Write an enzyme that holds these catalytic residues in place. Structure first.
Site, PDB file in Angstrom:
ATOM      1  N   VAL A   7       0.679  -1.601  -0.108  1.00 53.35           N
ATOM      2  CA  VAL A   7       0.265   0.290  -0.069  1.00 53.35           C
ATOM      3  C   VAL A   7       0.412   0.948  -0.437  1.00 53.35           C
ATOM      4  O   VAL A   7       1.966   1.475   0.942  1.00 53.35           O
ATOM      5  CB  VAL A   7      -1.181  -0.150   1.268  1.00 53.35           C
ATOM      6  CG1 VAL A   7      -1.106   0.606   2.247  1.00 53.35           C
ATOM      7  CG2 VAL A   7      -2.239  -0.289   0.515  1.00 53.35           C
ATOM      8  N   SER A   8       0.002   2.244  -0.838  1.00 49.73           N
ATOM      9  CA  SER A   8       1.204   3.626  -0.950  1.00 49.73           C
ATOM     10  C   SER A   8       1.315   4.582   0.613  1.00 49.73           C
ATOM     11  O   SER A   8       2.500   5.139   0.678  1.00 49.73           O
ATOM     12  CB  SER A   8       0.940   4.296  -2.043  1.00 49.73           C
ATOM     13  OG  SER A   8       0.679   4.336  -3.070  1.00 49.73           O
ATOM     14  N   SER A   9      -0.001   4.707   1.469  1.00 49.20           N
ATOM     15  CA  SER A   9       0.080   5.352   2.254  1.00 49.20           C
ATOM     16  C   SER A   9      -0.544   4.797   3.340  1.00 49.20           C
ATOM     17  O   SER A   9      -1.006   3.959   3.202  1.00 49.20           O
ATOM     18  CB  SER A   9      -0.595   6.518   2.138  1.00 49.20           C
ATOM     19  OG  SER A   9      -1.155   8.110   2.998  1.00 49.20           O
ATOM     20  N   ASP A  97      -3.987   3.696  -6.089  1.00 48.06           N
ATOM     21  CA  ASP A  97      -2.793   4.175  -5.600  1.00 48.06           C
ATOM     22  C   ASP A  97      -1.650   5.307  -7.081  1.00 48.06           C
ATOM     23  O   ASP A  97      -1.031   6.321  -6.524  1.00 48.06           O
ATOM     24  CB  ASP A  97      -1.531   3.146  -5.530  1.00 48.06           C
ATOM     25  CG  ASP A  97      -1.920   1.732  -4.236  1.00 48.06           C
ATOM     26  OD1 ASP A  97      -2.978   2.566  -3.601  1.00 48.06           O
ATOM     27  OD2 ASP A  97      -0.670   1.248  -3.543  1.00 48.06           O
TER      28      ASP A  97
END
Lengths: 133, 132
Positions: A7-9, A97
Site C-alpha cells: 500500500v502507498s500511504s 494508488d
C-alpha cells in the site's frame, strides 16, 4: 512461498486487509505452507526494505502478489527475468494508488528538470491539467 | 562474463548510443577486461528483449551501464537486490530523455484512469503545465 501485500500511504491500510485475505485464500486453495505474509507501506516506484529482503533471499522461490503493480508500477518484467535465472518466480493471484503515483513520478521528474524548489506544486498543477480533455 | 549495455528511447537519439559505447569500452579497457557492447532502443520502463535476455542469463555476472537510468528509470534497487541473491551485479560507469519518459508514463497512467481516448493529449498538457 512468500505472500506479499503493498500500500502507498498508511491511509490505505484497509487495502492491505483485502490483499492478505485474497493471498491466504490463494495459499489455502493449494494447501500451501506460508513462511511469510509480508505487508509493506511504500512507493510503487522510493525504498522498500521488506521487498529488498525478499528479493535478496534466494530461499523466497515463489513471491505471490495480488496484482502485478503491488510488486512494482514499473519494471516487473525485468525482476521476473532476473529471478528466472535463479529458478525463482512471481505469481499474480488476480489480473487505486495510481493518481498518487502520478504525483510522486512528476515530482521527482520536475525536481531533476527544474530544481526541487516547488517540484511537488508543479506536479500538482500537472496532474490537474491532465483531467479535462 | 561482463556485459556492456547501452540504451536509447527513440531511434532519433542514436548519437547518445555512441557516447555510451565509447564511455563503456573506455571503462572495460581501463581494467583490461574481455567483453562478451549490447545496444538497445526502447522505453525507460515498455518491452526490452535484449535486457530481458541479459537478466535471464546467469552467466552475465557483471552488467555495466553508463548511468543507472539506462538500465531502468524505476526499480533498479530491486533488480540489484534480486541479482545480489545470485552473486550478480550492476556496475555504473558514471554518476536527458526524461521529458520523453514523463509523457510515456503520464499517457499510460491517464489511459488507466480516464480511458485510452486522448490519453497522450492529457499527458501532453500535463508535461507542459510542469514547466512554469
Amino acid at each position: 512461498v512468500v505472500l506479499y501485500a503493498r500500500v502507498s500511504s498508511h491511509d490505505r491500510r484497509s487495502d492491505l486487509d483485502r490483499q492478505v485475505a485474497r493471498l491466504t485464500a490463494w495459499a489455502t486453495e493449494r494447501d500451501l505452507g506460508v513462511g511469510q505474509v509480508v505487508c509493506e507501506v511504500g512507493s510503487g516506484l522510493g525504498k522498500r526494505p521488506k521487498l529488498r529482503r525478499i528479493l535478496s533471499d534466494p530461499d523466497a522461490r515463489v513471491i505471490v502478489v495480488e496484482h502485478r503493480d503491488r510488486l512494482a508500477r514499473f519494471g516487473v518484467e525485468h525482476l521476473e527475468a532476473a529471478l528466472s535465472a535463479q529458478g525463482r518466480r512471481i505469481v499474480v493471484a488476480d489480473p487505486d494508488d495510481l493518481v498518487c503515483d502520478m504525483i510522486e513520478v512528476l515530482t521527482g521528474m520536475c525536481a531533476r528538470l527544474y530544481g526541487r524548489r516547488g517540484a511537488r506544486n508543479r506536479a500538482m498543477r500537472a496532474v490537474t491539467e491532465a483531467k479535462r480533455e
